[PDB]
């Protein structure tokens, strides 16, 4: 039971750091730009059997874009990552969304506001309009403090499988 998950968003927003949190359990301070794409199978044990996510961690930096759109084929779900501490990253969220729906239409897409741990927030959770529509959802997350760091996958699982009751174990 596996799903192709494309992870998109501006560079330095915390995409790869977020994955490493799940993959190894280790929070990583360093910032190493992803080259093109980086595939990581993430397996979560649930109360209804194991679920594997084939996470496609794409690059945010224009120089290391890789195939960009080419990575999107046959995606079943996606996570759009932006920085809570960076206004310019949230401004680009519409363009990322537009790119996905031009390749993958009506797939479950989660908006993720990362680095909510930061003292001075520059993007208010109130102003977000993404979760107001359905098929779309938002979660305040933090790869450092692990705040709601499992929410996006659990939500996507409930959408991909189709069971609201489903829980992680």
């Amino acid at each position: 039971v596996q799903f192709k998950l494309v992870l998109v968003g501006d560079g330095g927003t915390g995409k790869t750091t977020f994955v490493k949190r799940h993959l190894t359990g280790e929070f990583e301070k360093k910032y190493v730009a992803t080259l093109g794409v980086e595939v990581h199978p993430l397996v979560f044990h649930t109360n209804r059997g194991p679920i594997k996510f084939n996470v496609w961690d794409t690059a945010g930096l224009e120089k290391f874009g890789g195939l960009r759109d080419g990575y999107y084929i046959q995606a079943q779900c996606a996570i759009i990552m932006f920085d809570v501490t960076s206004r310019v990253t949230y401004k680009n969220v519409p363009n990322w969304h537009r790119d996905l729906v031009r390749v993958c239409e009506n797939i479950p897409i989660v908006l993720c506001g990362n680095k909510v741990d930061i003292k001075d927030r520059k993007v208010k959770a109130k102003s977000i309009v993404f979760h107001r529509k359905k098929n779309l959802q938002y979660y305040d997350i933090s790869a450092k403090s692990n705040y709601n760091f499992e929410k996006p996958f659990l939500w996507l699982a409930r959408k991909l499988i189709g069971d609201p009751n489903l829980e992680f174990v």
Binding site: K29, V32, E38, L67, G70, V88
Partner: protein, 871 residues
């Protein structure tokens, strides 16, 4: 160029090989293929061969990605031939996967936007395919994405050429609208609306023409018919919202405005039809249309209410939506409400109607067992409600609403879930309510304390939070302090109520510290057995913080006595011995006990052992250093700490030792008795530091170390600069600083740009004092030696290494360099501009002129900005 057999092979791996390590490698080879010159020829062939869906998407996408990035490497003559290819390709593959049709559509649009020799492209495309019914689906797809691509960051069309584009489309906006009518005469229907909506969003459609046009009528038509599918519905809604948004001035677009206003009002019936059924998808769309409608005609509702455009059925439609049992429906309208309140008597009744609607949305399920959880989806919603109420409460009156909410909590024998929800909204506003009218305020508090223990847990919980929000009323009415505390004392002793109580107690302690001295006896006794109440770490810390805030206000005599008791329980527990929690509890006590060194002596020995036991564990050490930081916040600790710091750091390079070091320098750096010892610490700390950064990827792997090292250096350069400048260690610091300029880690880079700025500025700042000439010479030496290497490094990072957000920090450093020696800098900059790998000599020249001739720092940043774009 690679063989055709190889790319078909690499594609099947990338799309079917389950292994991650292999899938990445195929990706990279295909990646290098797109960047290469061979990409054009291969892609064109793949689409002609059309083996399968996988390879055709890649070729079409590559076609698009090569047109929007590598358009420059095409001879003018090739343009016409490439266009014929893409149009032939999209023809042949028109019934293939839709995801392939889009990419080709995108490619043609991106091509057209960059091809001025293809004038009247809108006209060309339509009259070639409009009559073929099977051509229509991809023609529309191109027509939809074309206006969207005009603001493409991937294309980044010049400002003048972009303006030409938009007005060129406006010219032909008639032709596509005309076409869009022929088109609709379900799958096809929604394609039409999306296309219509897209041209609306560009703001190039004629309001007056669209005002009287069948397309508009068709929009509201399908939005009225109950039989219409979910997909046609969403498309129609989105197009309506696009129509409304495109209206910037209602007056200039009055024909269109009136048509749309009347149109959406006819949907109220369709709304009721959708809510009669369980069609939640449809109602969310209607609620979106309504909220968008009120935003557009907000001005008319305000200026001439009730009359025409100001027809108050608009606000009513929202209050109906507000009444909906599904909470995902009402939050859609929250932003308008914010905006309505923001612009703001006629509305008052509407806002108070809304508040009652939100009050009921906060009602928990009658079978709810525990406390209201904040983490879940619904607890988040309650907060969004709480925040919205705070911002609108001024339209009712914080005295009017607070009293009114409380009054309705005795009539009709209110069930527990109705009480909790009313208490919740009261707590939301309990802070903003003016404590002038105390009687109505102070009687609410008396009501909450007389609540029996028998009431539902969740009612006890929210009432504790309400009391917590009412700390200003306990400050103005000190008699209620003892009853309030006692009530909170009961909640603290109940496990699921503990955290809420501890938080509420802390609020009281902070505001009512002036006369809290009596109760301190109790607070200490809570601390003495803190881990019995099953508290959260946050609630625990917050509790100890409170008692420490009032201890500082106690009589000086009893302070030293009670402080030692507060810490002894912690010390004895550590002595018995993961110490993190007690380290964190010690730290907060010190942090807010600000009326001490007598107690510090008792603490130091157990901390040193704790630090040394877990000297390998960064997380514990980090909490350890935080603790030690606040204890200082006492020269008897200095040397035994510095020694231990250096010794631990020697084997475990915890960067928090650097930061802790920076604190000692910030606090004792001005004391010339310490200046030598502090410099020794720095020189000692730098040795294991440089060892870390000397390693491969040393800067990338320890950005935390880079950040904290230069915070230390910065504290030095602003507390005792001369001590650092005459030292020998300042030279490798500066070198690493210069090396650190290419570190893309944002936090660490701000710190580095900060040290360089503050360092160079020392040769300029405060020329009024005597030692200025010494500092002037020391920097002059430094600038002589390294000045040319810094400027070259700074210029390098701006153009190739770091993201645009660093520019103001670099510009600030560059500015200080000109303050030290501008004529020399003018020479330096020419060398930096000399070594560059394109960019015309004219551009380098006028860049040099702007920067070197800058009179404000602002001018340097813009100068860097424009030049940086070139790379």
């Amino acid at each position: 160029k690679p063989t055709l057999q190889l790319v078909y092979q690499a594609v099947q791996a990338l799309y079917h090989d389950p292994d991650p390590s292999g899938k990445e490698r195929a990706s990279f080879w295909l990646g290098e293929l797109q960047r290469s010159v061979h990409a054009w020829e291969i892609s064109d062939q793949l689409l002609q061969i059309r083996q399968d869906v996988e390879s055709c998407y890649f070729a079409a996408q590559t076609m698009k990605m090569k047109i929007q990035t590598s358009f420059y490497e095409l001879p003018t003559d090739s343009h016409a031939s490439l266009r014929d290819s893409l149009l032939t390709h999209i023809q042949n593959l028109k019934d293939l996967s839709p995801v392939i049709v889009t990419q080709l559509a995108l490619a043609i649009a991106d091509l057209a936007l960059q091809m001025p020799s293809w004038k009247g492209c809108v006209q060309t495309l339509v009259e070639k395919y409009s009559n073929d019914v099977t051509s229509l689906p991809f023609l529309l797809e191109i027509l939809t994405v074309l206006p969207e691509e005009v603001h493409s960051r991937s294309l980044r069309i010049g400002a003048n050429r972009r303006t030409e584009i938009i007005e060129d489309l406006a010219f032909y906006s008639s032709t596509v609208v005309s076409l869009l009518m022929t088109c609709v005469e379900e799958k096809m229907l929604m394609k039409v609306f999306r296309c219509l909506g897209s041209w609306f969003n560009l703001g190039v459609l004629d309001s007056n023409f669209m005002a009287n046009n069948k397309l508009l009528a068709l929009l509201f038509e399908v939005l009225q018919q109950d039989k219409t599918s979910s997909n046609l519905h969403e498309a129609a809604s989105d197009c309506v919202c696009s129509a409304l948004y495109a209206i910037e001035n209602v007056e200039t677009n009055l024909p269109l405005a009136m048509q749309l206003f009347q149109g959406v009002l006819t949907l109220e019936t369709a709304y009721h039809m959708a809510v009669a059924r369980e069609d939640l998808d449809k109602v969310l769309n209607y609620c979106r249309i309504f909220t968008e409608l009120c935003e557009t005609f907000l001005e008319k509702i305000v200026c001439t209410p009730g009359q025409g455009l100001g027809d108050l059925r608009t606000l009513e439609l929202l209050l109906i939506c507000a009444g909906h049992p599904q909470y995902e429906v009402v939050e859609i309208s929250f932003n308008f409400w914010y905006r309505l309140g923001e612009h703001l008597g006629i509305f008052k009744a509407y806002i108070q109607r809304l508040l009652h609607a939100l009050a009921r949305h906060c009602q928990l399920e009658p079978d709810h067992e525990g406390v209201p959880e904040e983490t879940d989806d619904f607890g988040e919603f309650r907060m969004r409600v709480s925040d919205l109420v705070k911002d609108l409460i001024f339209l009712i009156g914080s005295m009017e609403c607070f009293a009114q909410l409380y009054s309705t909590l005795k009539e009709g024998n209110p069930p527990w879930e109705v009480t909790e929800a009313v208490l919740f909204i009261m707590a939301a506003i309990a802070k903003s309510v003016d404590p002038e009218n105390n009687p109505t305020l102070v009687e609410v508090l008396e009501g909450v304390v007389r609540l029996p223990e028998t009431v539902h847990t969740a009612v006890r919980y929210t009432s504790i939070e309400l009391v917590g929000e009412m700390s200003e009323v306990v400050d103005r009415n000190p008699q209620f302090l003892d009853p309030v505390l006692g009530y909170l004392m009961k909640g603290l002793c109940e496990k699921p109520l503990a955290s809420a109580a501890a938080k509420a107690i802390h609020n009281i302690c902070s505001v009512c510290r002036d006369h809290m001295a009596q109760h301190f006896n109790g607070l200490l006794e809570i601390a003495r057995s803190l881990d019995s109440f099953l508290l959260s770490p946050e609630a625990a810390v917050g509790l100890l913080k409170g008692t420490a805030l009032v201890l500082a206000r106690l009589p000086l005599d009893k302070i030293t006595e009670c402080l030692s008791e507060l810490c002894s329980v912690q010390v004895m527990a550590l002595k018995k011995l993961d110490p993190t929690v007690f380290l964190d509890r010690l730290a907060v006590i010190f942090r807010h006990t600000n009326p001490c060194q007598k107690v510090i002596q008792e603490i130091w020995p157990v901390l040193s052992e704790t630090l040394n036991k877990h000297r390998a564990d960064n997380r514990i050490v980090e909490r350890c250093c935080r603790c030690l930081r606040f204890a200082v916040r006492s020269a008897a600790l200095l040397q035994p700490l510095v020694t231990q710091m250096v010794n631990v750091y020697h084997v475990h390079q915890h960067s928090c030792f650097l930061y802790l070091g920076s604190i000692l320098v910030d606090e004792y750096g001005m004391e010339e008795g310490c200046r030598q010892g502090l410099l020794d610490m720095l020189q000692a700390l730098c040795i294991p530091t440089f060892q870390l950064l000397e390693q491969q990827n040393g800067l990338q792997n320890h950005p935390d170390t880079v950040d904290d090292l230069f915070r230390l250096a910065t504290r030095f350069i602003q507390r005792s600069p001369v001590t650092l400048l005459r030292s020998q260690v300042v030279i490798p610091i500066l070198q690493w600083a210069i090396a650190s300029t290419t570190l893309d880690h944002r936090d660490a880079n701000c710190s580095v740009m900060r040290f360089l700025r503050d360092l160079i500025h020392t040769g300029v700042a405060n020329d009024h004092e005597e030692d200025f000439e010494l500092r002037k010479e020391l920097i002059g030496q430094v600038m002589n030696q390294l000045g040319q290497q810094l400027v070259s490094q700074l210029l390098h990072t701006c153009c190739f290494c770091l993201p645009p957000y660093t520019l103001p920090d670099v510009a600030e450093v560059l500015w200080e360099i000109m303050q030290v020696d501008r004529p020399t800098f003018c020479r330096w900059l020419e060398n930096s501009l000399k070594g560059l790998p394109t960019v015309t000599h004219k551009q380098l020249t006028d860049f040099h002129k702007q920067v070197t001739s800058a009179e404000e720092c602002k001018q340097v940043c813009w100068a860097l900005r424009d030049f940086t774009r070139l790379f």
